[PDB]
Structures are given as structure tokens and as C-alpha cells.
Amino acid sequence: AGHMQTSFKTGDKAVYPGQGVGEVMGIEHTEVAGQRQSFYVLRILENGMRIMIPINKVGSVGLREIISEED
């Protein structure tokens, strides 16, 4: 057998490079400068704030979980 760590859909929670608080609330899809450009909808659990994340800097997820909680 084997195991690995790949990306997850909406509902992922991890420490992103900026604050570390936020859960992926969805994905956004729009057209900027006449070109298709996707974004990540990150809701900041701190106060219910919203911070957009352009995939241009991300390249995959940019998130890393440190919650070492197991059985």
C-alpha cells in the first residue's frame, strides 16, 4: 500500500502566508484585462472578513496546515 498529500476542494483549513487564519469558502472565476483569471475565496474566521487570492501567485494552493492533531 501507500499514502500521500494532494490538494483539497472548498472547505480546506491551513496556515497561508500572511495571517494563518482562514478556511476556503469557495473559488471565484472572472475575466480581468480581457483574460480569464481565477481566484480563491478565503473567509477570515477572525471576524468573518473576506480576502481574495489571485492564483497567479499561488500556482496550486499556497496553504500549509500545522495542526498535528491525531488519534
**Domains of the chain, CATH where assigned:** 1-71 (2.40.10.170)
The answer to whether the CB of 28 falls within 8 A of the CB of 52 is yes
The answer to whether the CB of 15 falls within 8 A of the CB of 63 is yes
As a three-state string, the secondary structure of the chain is CCCCCCCCCCCCECECCCCCCCEEEEEEEEEECCEEEEEEEEEECCCCEEEEEEHHHHCCCCCECCCCCCC
Tell me the technique behind this structure. Answer: NMR
How would you class 36 by CB atoms within 10 Å of its CB: exposed for 0-12, middle for 13-18, buried for 19 or more?
exposed
The answer to whether the CB of 12 falls within 8 A of the CB of 23 is yes
CA pair distance 68, 49, nearest whole angstrom:
26
